[model samples]
Target: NSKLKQDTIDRLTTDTYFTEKEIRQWHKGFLKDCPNGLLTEQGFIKIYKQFFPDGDPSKFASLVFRVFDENNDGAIEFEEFIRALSITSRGNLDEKLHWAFRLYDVDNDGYITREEMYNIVDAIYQMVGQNTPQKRVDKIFDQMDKNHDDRLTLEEFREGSKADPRMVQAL
Candidate 1:
């Protein structure tokens, strides 16, 4: 167990915000919570529901699980979960924006399409009993889409976010 702990500590400290001490604490808690080292979608939803007690958490929680799952394996590996949590909780703005792009790229195709954006927007609105509007996505495409294509590239997303103050706000 100490061998595994040592590896985990070095892995995270090298690639994430978690220090050696923090990584050990997180690993302890993670193992205690998920002895199998993978978090199922049901477990994720159960935790997500706690933060939004009044809303229907299934859709939004499902989307979040997909983003965190990383490898499309249908379960969140401990490393994936911890790394994602680290980026969201403490990583720099650059790291945060890249992670945000992952959420919208539902198919993991390295591009954000209109349909993907629509689905992501609607997922957020689901927590509030509302639907996403098409025009909202349309406006984004109009502004940041340099080539007028149906999808936005990673650099385009970054540029658009930096140019318009409201773009990141929409994220």
Candidate 2:
């Protein structure tokens, strides 16, 4: 027990914003829900659906699961879950945008291709039961692609979020 706690202390202390006490509390809840200290994609999706019961969250949940499952492993452990929760909850603007960029990047590439953005946007829209018509989709590419480079960089994404604060909050 000390070994696991020690590792979390060492790793989270420097990299994450979570307090040790808060970490302990979160770990308690995490394990209470995931008895084995691990959560599968389906388990994550089940929890995801509860909050978003109105639409098809399956694809979006899968997309979210892909990021939270950082190791590409089939399961997500406490550390991964807490770390992701921290970023969304307490991380700085840049950090939040970075995670969003990572989500839309999909293929793990540095740049966000137009197609990748389309897929993610469509995923989110479909998940929320919103229809992403071409007009709605057209605005993002036009608004975000500063250099008309056909793709977006982290800088561009940051700028885009600043322009539309709702975009960040929607996540």
Candidate 3:
């Protein structure tokens, strides 16, 4: 389709390691609502909500948008979208962990504070239609707060997932 440049698609195949069919599907999905080939922040939010309809995923969606909007222009282009999908879905473990950290780190302060983690966890619970418990939140901190600094570093987050295979799968 003329909607996507051939060179762009080629680059996506190489960088994202997505097959031609997968890339075509992605392009079609991108053009479904974003006919102009760009996804605004609200567009991104709507897409995320379609995937998570039970509860509010707006917070997490906003963070994801921020991550994908490489130019901080409040919009995501096709390249960025493919790159984000590639990294989140097929990237190495460290890449996935780093992406998870950004989602958890609501404040974007380079560390996931207790409150930030609780907020993200609460959001996750809400998205999954589960009742959130403060006790559970506290327990998560207990498990991951390796340095006892009342916050979670990226290392601690990774370690927490490693220590709990269930957590990693959930992640």
Candidate 4:
């Protein structure tokens, strides 16, 4: 009952770099919540909130939206939505690190500054309704800021992630 034909799915699989099965699943998942196959900013926030029930979504919805809304259209299309999830879930380590770095780099800068790291950590803590201590944040920053430069270059972040298996999963 979906408008997506086999040929269309094939093309989507190639274009999105997701397997046919994954594409189909994502299509169904998208339509299950977004009947129109388009996810608005508010709609995306609602979905995000589903995962972080205790968090104030408003604190980071814009950042998440900015990351996912690749076209700057204020809405997420099927390609953008699926591509992001695909990368974060199935992409290689480098790709995942790139995506994670982009997610935390709120200012769109090439590096993650100390303030950026702190803000992301605070948002996460707020998202989980947990009080993450400053020491914990400091330790994380210390680990991630390998050069002790007060910022995280992609290399440093990537190395830090490689050093700790849980770090990759946590992001």
Q: Give candidate 1 misplaced runs (Cα > 4 Å).
A: 1-4, 130-132, 163-171
RMSD list, candidates in order: 3.9, 4.3, 4.2, 4.7
Residue lDDT tens for model 3, 41-137:
8887887799988788787788778878867788899888888889898888888888788777766788888787777776666666653557777
lDDT against the true structure, each candidate: 0.81, 0.82, 0.80, 0.77
In model 3, state the lDDT of residue 122. 68
Instruction: State, as a TM-score between 0 and 1, how close model 2 is to the true structure.
Output: 0.88
lDDT for predicted candidate 2 compared with the true structure: 0.82
Candidate 1 has an lDDT of 0.81
lDDT per residue as tens, model 2, 63-150 = 8898999999888888888889889999988899999999988998788887887788777777787435455557887998889988
Reference-based TM-score of each model: 0.85, 0.88, 0.77, 0.77
Q: Clashing residue pairs in candidate 2, if any?
A: none
Higher-ranked by TM-score: 1 or 2: 2
Candidate 1, residues 1-171, lDDT tens digits: the string is 322356666787899887778777777787787887778999999997887777777787898898898888999877788889999999877788898888888778999999998887776676665424588899888888899988999888767766546777699
Give candidate 3 misplaced runs (Cα > 4 Å): 1-3, 131-133, 164-171
Count of backbone collisions within predicted model 3: 0
Clashing pairs in 1: none
Provide the lowest-lDDT 10-residue window in model 2.
Answer: 129-138
Question: Candidate 1: TM-score?
Answer: 0.85
lDDT of 3: 0.80
| Model 2 lDDT at residue 2 | 19
